[PDB]
Structure formats: C-alpha cells, structure tokens
C-alpha cells in the first residue's frame, strides 16, 4: 500500500471505468433479475470477472508495449486477420453503438429532466452525436475541455447519491430481500444481468495499453488493477444499495432513467435537478470521450492495408492532428444505430461483441505462455493459470448466454464482424485506395 507513483494511475483506472453506467443500467439489471438480491450479485461477479480479466490482459499488454492494444495482441498471436477483425468490429460496431447508446440515453434523460415529449429523443440523440463529432474536429482544446469537467462532476452526483440513498428514511437490509424470484428464473436472468453490469464495468480493457506505457511495471501495477477495479466494484455495489433503499426491483426496471428517479426522492426541488445535470454531463463526457478514442481505430487499419479507402481514412488534417474521416464513417453507422436500435439492445451488442475478442486475448496470454515462453515478461499474471481461466470461464459464459438469450443481437454483431472478412481480403491485394 501507498506507492505514490501509481495513485495517479489508479485515478485512471477508476475514471476509465466509472461514468454513465450506474446512472442508466439498473433498468435492465432489475428488469432481468426480477428481484433486488440477484441483480446486486451481478454487479459483484461482473466486477470480480474484470479484476480477473484486467490482470490477465496486462501480461500481453507488457509483452506488446503499445497504445494500439488488441488490434496488435490478436495479430501477434492469432495472425493479421484477427488483428483486423478486432478493429473491424471496433470501428463498425463497438465505437458506433457506444456513441449511439449513450447519445440515446442522453436525450432520454434530457426529456426526463426538461420534461419534454418522448417523440423528441432520437432528434436529440442525433444532434448530440452530430454536435460532438463536429466539436471533436474543432480539436482537443474542446474535446478535452469537456473531459476534465466530465471527470470532476461525475463523482459528485454519486457521493451525494450514496450518502443520502444509504441514509434513506424507509430503508436498511430488507430493501434487498427478494433474492431470486420465479417470474425471472436464475440462469436466463443472471445472463441478461451480467451483460448489463458489464457495460458499466466497460473500458477495463484499457489496462493493456496502461501496462504498455508502464516503466518498471510489477512494482505496484497489479495493486493498481486490484485496487482500481475494486474501488469501482465498491462504488457500483454501494450506489446500488442506495438505489434499492429508495425504489426496488420492479420500480427500477420501470423507468428507463433509474438513477434520475432515485435522485428526485433523495432530494427535493432543484437539489435533485443538480444531480440529473450531473448525470447528463456524465453521459456527454462519455459520448465525447468515446469519439476521442474512437478515431484511433479506422486510422490504424488505414495504417495497414486493411481498409478500402486507406488513403482517405489515414488523412490526418494538418490543423487538428486527427483522422476525422474515420469519425465521419463512425457517425454515420452510429446514426443508423440510433435510428435502428434501442439503448439496452445496443449496450448488449457491445458487451457480447467485445468479449468475443476479449476472451481470445486472455486465451492468447496462455497461448503466448507456450509459443514464446522465452519472450520478455515485465509483468506476469499472478496465480498463473487460475485467474486467466477465471476470466475465460466467465468470458465464455457471456458469449454463450447472450447467444441463447438474444439471438438477433448475437447475429447483428456476427453479420457485421464477418462482413469484414471480404473487406480484409479485397484490400490486401489491392491495398485500399
């Protein structure tokens, strides 16, 4: 404990993960668990999964010190195609739906606060995404200016919700007593529950690039993933107890803006409005921060042969230093996704899709341990086979449980991942344009 070099990194770990997740997901988690008790474990196990996932992905992250992440872990053990399919889905599914989902949910909350028509959600989701894509092409003056406040004023609506929520007048241990209900049976439920809590835990993957950047890693590096994601774990459980102290299972699942309602009970008048402003900020900072780290992918495929208009995609505008053309493609496919999907449907794709490759990455660490067990390992996954296999065990479990629950979602991501198999090979002989 107390290394000082890494309490700075720990900031990141908490910040990368924490955001707009807890503020909107309960609606899904309780609408699937059908009981407070089962939903509350899903946040714990998903968290215990990613503390697992995070430590396994750091070994491959230290073998390959790079900011590219996965795009390169997967080429390096699974060949140029999987280095590609990773990015192809990142560029066509993951980034566009993460803009999309969040922009939708924003508008949703905007209409909830400034009590407006529930028709005018999509136009607002369009215009936030269109605005923030545009604003990002102005430069990292503004993009980053949104980010700094978005990190200050995402922790305050929480610390204010936990304090008061846990202190709610009608409340205590009884406010989570139905553990597993028969209307929502445990197995079908825990699969739709984990995939909804795992969206809140998202961005934990960035630990590979973090460990890449590290200097003399092990010293405190595992403590930073342990401590980091367990502070996130700690928070995500504690603010849920607060939500269940005010409302409960049926009620949370009821409005698609859960935290916003618990706000309006916890505080009367503008007090609770100041909390929802904090939420709309938290959502907007994510949208923007996703765009920010989104423009990186189409460009890295434009770095290689991998994309049809590689020259147009790789264009960094000499003014801003950003490949805006990647984001104009991602704005389009995000906009189709806002008009075609529904927030939870989308936030589900995202967990399924990414974990299809994330698994591969952990599997890869164990592969790597047998391909070149003489490569240099600055950080090595502790309790060696246990935890990567834990992450795999839980990883595998999601991709099978989403298949079997959401067959359409499992196919939209699969249609769109495998629509890139032709793409890859067209522009490998031709090399793009």
């Amino acid at each position, epitope marked *: 404990m107390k290394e000082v070099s890494g309490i700075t990194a720990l900031t990141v770990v908490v910040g990368t993960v924490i955001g707009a997740g807890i503020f909107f997901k309960p609606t899904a988690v309780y609408g699937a668990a059908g009981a407070p008790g089962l939903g509350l474990l899903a946040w714990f196990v998903a968290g215990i999964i990613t503390i697992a996932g995070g430590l396994t992905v750091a070994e491959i992250g230290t073998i390959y*010190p*790079q*900011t*590219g992440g996965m795009m390169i872990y997967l080429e390096k053990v699974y060949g140029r195609w999987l280095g590609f399919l990773v990015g192809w889905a990142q560029m066509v599914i993951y980034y566009p739906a993460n803009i999309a989902a969040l922009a939708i949910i924003f508008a949703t909350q905007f209409v909830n606060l400034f009590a407006l028509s529930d028709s005018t959600i999509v136009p607002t989701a369009i215009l936030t995404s269109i605005f923030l894509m545009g604003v990002n092409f102005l430069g990292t003056k503004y993009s980053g200016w949104i980010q700094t406040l978005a990190t200050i004023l995402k922790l305050i609506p929480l610390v204010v919700i936990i304090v008061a929520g846990l202190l709610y007048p009608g409340g205590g241990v009884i406010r989570l007593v139905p553990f597993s209900v028969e209307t929502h049976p445990v197995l079908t439920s825990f699969g739709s529950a984990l995939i909804a809590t795992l969206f809140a835990y998202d961005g934990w993957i960035n630990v590979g690039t973090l460990a*890449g950047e590290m200097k003399n890693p092990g010293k405190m590096l595992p403590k930073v993933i342990i401590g980091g994601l367990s502070i996130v774990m700690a928070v995500y459980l504690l603010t849920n107890i607060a939500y269940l102290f005010v409302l409960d299972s049926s009620q949370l699942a009821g409005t698609d803006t859960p935290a916003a309602l618990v706000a309006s009970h916890l505080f009367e008048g503008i007090g609770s409005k100041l909390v929802t402003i904090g939420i709309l900020i938290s959502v907007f900072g994510g949208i923007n921060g996703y765009i920010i780290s989104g423009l990186r992918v189409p460009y890295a495929l434009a*770095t290689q042969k991998m994309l049809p208009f590689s020259d147009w995609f790789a*264009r960094i*505008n000499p003014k801003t*230093n950003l490949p805006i053309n990647g984001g104009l493609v991602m704005l389009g496919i995000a906009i189709v996704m806002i008009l075609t999907g529904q927030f939870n449907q989308l936030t589900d794709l995202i967990v399924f899709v990414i974990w299809f490759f994330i698994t591969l990455t952990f599997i890869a660490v164990i592969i790597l341990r047998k391909t070149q067990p003489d490569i240099e390992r600055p950080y090595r996954v502790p309790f060696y086979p246990v935890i990567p296999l834990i992450a795999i065990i839980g990883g595998l479990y999601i991709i099978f449980n989403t298949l079997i629950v959401q067959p359409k979602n499992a196919f939209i991501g699969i249609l769109l991942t495998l629509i890139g198999i032709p793409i890859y090979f067209y522009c490998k002989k031709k090399y793009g344009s």
Partner: nanobody
Amino acid sequence: QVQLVESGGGVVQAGGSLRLSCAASGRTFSSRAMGWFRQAPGEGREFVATISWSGSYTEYADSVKGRVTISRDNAKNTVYLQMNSLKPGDTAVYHCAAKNGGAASNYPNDYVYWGQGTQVTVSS
C-alpha cells in the same frame, strides 16, 4: 522540455539507403516511446515507425515495412530510421516525435514533442 533534432536525410537515388538520426534532450528519453512520421508537401503527417522505450516493440506502416528499421540508442539518447530500397514516393520531411510512456504509437496525436524534421528527396 524535450528538444528533438533530426539528421541524415537529403537527396538519394532510387533503390538506395538512408539512415536517419534523432537526438533528444536527455533524461526523459530512455523512459519515452519514440517514433518517426513523414509529411509530404501536399499531405499532413503520416505514420512511419515507432519504438518502445526499451526498444522491444517496433511497428512500421504498410508502405515502409520491410525497408525501414527503427532502432534507438538509449545510452546516447537517439532514435534511428534505417530506410533502404528507397522509392521516389518516400520524399517528404521526416519529423521525429516523442511522447510519454513506453508504449509505442502509430497515432500522431499521442506524440507531444515533435521535431523540425529532415527533408528527404528520393529520385531517379
């Protein structure tokens, strides 16, 4: 506080070979990832190479893979770019940049310190 100065690149012949050098401020170098980028007089920047702090990871762009080789001498705070089999579509100012942390980057925006760049002209 990290000054970088490029060396070597001038007029060269097709198929020929050119070693580029980039001298950096010091201290911070050994802990920093490096990389070269090239800027043609119609385009913006473009990824060429990048190397880990320890020099373990290395990554080159599609058009220069196989020809060029990036390398660094942390003892003499320098990063090299051993280009070979040069084509006249290489011709551009090769700026050498620095960023923070060991992880190498193909992204120009990661890079915070940037050099003036040395002009290269490959001809026939």
